[PDB]
Amino acid sequence: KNIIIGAMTALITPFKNGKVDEQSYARLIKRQIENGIDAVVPVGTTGESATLTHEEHRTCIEIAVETCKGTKVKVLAGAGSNATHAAVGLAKFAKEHGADGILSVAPYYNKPTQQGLYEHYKAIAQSVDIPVLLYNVPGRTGCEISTDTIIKLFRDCENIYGVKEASGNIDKCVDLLAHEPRMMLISGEDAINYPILSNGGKGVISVTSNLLPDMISALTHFALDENYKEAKKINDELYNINKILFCESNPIPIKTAMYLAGLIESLEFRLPLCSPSKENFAKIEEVMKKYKIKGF
Amino acid sequence: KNIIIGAMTALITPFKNGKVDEQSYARLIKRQIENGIDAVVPVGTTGESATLTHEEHRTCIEIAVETCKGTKVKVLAGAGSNATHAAVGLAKFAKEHGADGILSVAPYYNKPTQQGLYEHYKAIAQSVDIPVLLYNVPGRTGCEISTDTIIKLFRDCENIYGVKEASGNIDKCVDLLAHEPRMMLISGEDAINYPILSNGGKGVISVTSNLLPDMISALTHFALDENYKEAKKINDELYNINKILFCESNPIPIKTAMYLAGLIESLEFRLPLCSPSKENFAKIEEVMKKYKIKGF
Ligand SMILES: NCCCC[C@@](N)(CC[C@](N)(CCCCN)C(=O)O)C(=O)O
Ligand SMILES: [Mg+2]
Ligand SMILES: [Mg+2]
Ligand SMILES: [Mg+2]
Ligand SMILES: [Mg+2]
């Protein structure tokens, strides 16, 4: 199976006067490339996929593909949808426009059954020939891809090579890798990056890496080399920022942090997402002071 | 405040080949009208809003308005979105195409803060002059509209007049009507229709009414006329079918029941939704036998 693993960043999408700041987007991706990141994920949840138009979503995939040409950094395009026909269309766009693979979140709101999730992902995987990473985040979608469904899709669909778990369930991550040790388990939960890697996970899709890509990259590569003392040390040091980046709904804190670090021009969201509270703004600012934030 | 209350049906959307069966759709609405229903809700969750195109969503609103003209039946159009710009667009379409009001679900997946929900709904309410009913279903959206936010929106916006609660939280329904008794609390949870009505709720937006509109209508009208004895009696009798209609994710069981009753031609969903499992198919069929289903 072809895989995309290592340290990866769920890219934020900067806005300027209600439109996608495309130069800031490319500049942010190049900052990720230059700090050891192995792959970037345009237009995930952290990239506000819900409020981008289908055309802006496509533009951001293209910018990511264009920016990473001539580097070893891969593009794992955000292509999830709660409608299978739309998810197939995004997957086909990502394939035809040079993405190295796709991340495909479990359908949200409409709560498909396990059989529906299987058929949903089978239709996506059969539509392209690039690697497909499942994405389970039940707190966001209202549905869970069971371990059995993940393993079945991995074994039945040639290009489905793993899952990005954001479920706070280390038991499930043992379950997954004990029964199917060839799949690529990816951490979608920064605070527990090291435990997931230490059990045989092969990478991270990180929110914190937007702010501290060098630290998340070092953590992941230490862990992949079984240097668990150095990987755990970074994971422990990052715990405070990893948690405060979810004091409000992601990506509200991370965009606040990027703005406070001067890495983005304006602190702009698209409704229903909004600027954080004044208290949380100050709490994000205070935790940042304990970390060294790389510039451009 | 202008309000839309009473017994309301979250209409299923029948498919025929790969498209919406528009004549069956109109036929189902006239069956609802004939069975005492006060309003119909096109393209809600039960109507598979996630997998309809924006054009199909708009078409189903038009058919509902067309069909309910000259009857007392109102159209509370499903107009929710997890992107505020899209929810404003659906709200404005519903106003300009003759809907009596809109149902607007809390944003799903991107999980806005309470402040974001306020601004999301304030932007929608200010975009039209027809009643707006909030819709809280955290099991599916991943977020909750708090009691404080619902009451604030009710008091701050002229056309926001209440909430359809599908949260299994009768405590919250006491909280809502004790602090703001002027709002229209609507049950979005069939099994507990009567308890919500008996506490001062003023209507239901029902899934079971798709199959048994006469029973849900009588239940609501018994309760609003303070005949609690008969309202509870129908609620108790409907419990078995109310529960089996969610043995799998709505609207998979209700569409199965409508197909088994001969009310729709094919048992068709749009992926990721799928026909139910086989023993669940038999359980829906067995519970249906204890109820008298009205034909056309
Ligand atoms: N990423 C670019 C497009 C985003 C579209 C959407 N906001 C809404 C998705 C949708 N399936 C739209 C269909 C609604 C038509 N009635 C949904 O709202 O469920 C989402 O996927 O979150
Ligand atoms: Mg727009
Ligand atoms: Mg180059
Ligand atoms: Mg090495
Ligand atoms: Mg009436």
Swiss-Prot record, chains A, B:
It comes from the Bacteria. The active site is at 135 (proton donor/acceptor), 164 (schiff-base intermediate with substrate). CDD domains: DHDPS (cd00950). One of its GO terms (biological process) is lysine biosynthetic process via diaminopimelate. Keywords: Amino-acid biosynthesis, Cytoplasm, Diaminopimelate biosynthesis, Lyase, Lysine biosynthesis, Schiff base. It is found in: Cytoplasm. Its EC number is 4.3.3.7. One of its GO terms (molecular function) is 4-hydroxy-tetrahydrodipicolinate synthase activity. The record marks 45, 109 as: Part of a proton relay during catalysis. Pyruvate binds at residues 46, 205. Gene3D superfamilies: Aldolase class I. It catalyses: L-aspartate 4-semialdehyde + pyruvate = (2S,4S)-4-hydroxy-2,3,4,5-tetrahydrodipicolinate + H2O + H(+). GO terms for cellular component: cytosol. NCBIfam families: dapA. Homotetramer; dimer of dimers. Belongs to the DapA family. Catalyzes the condensation of (S)-aspartate-beta-semialdehyde [(S)-ASA] and pyruvate to 4-hydroxy-tetrahydrodipicolinate (HTPA). This is 4-hydroxy-tetrahydrodipicolinate synthase. It comes from Campylobacter jejuni subsp. jejuni serotype O:2 (strain ATCC 700819 / NCTC 11168). The gene is dapA.
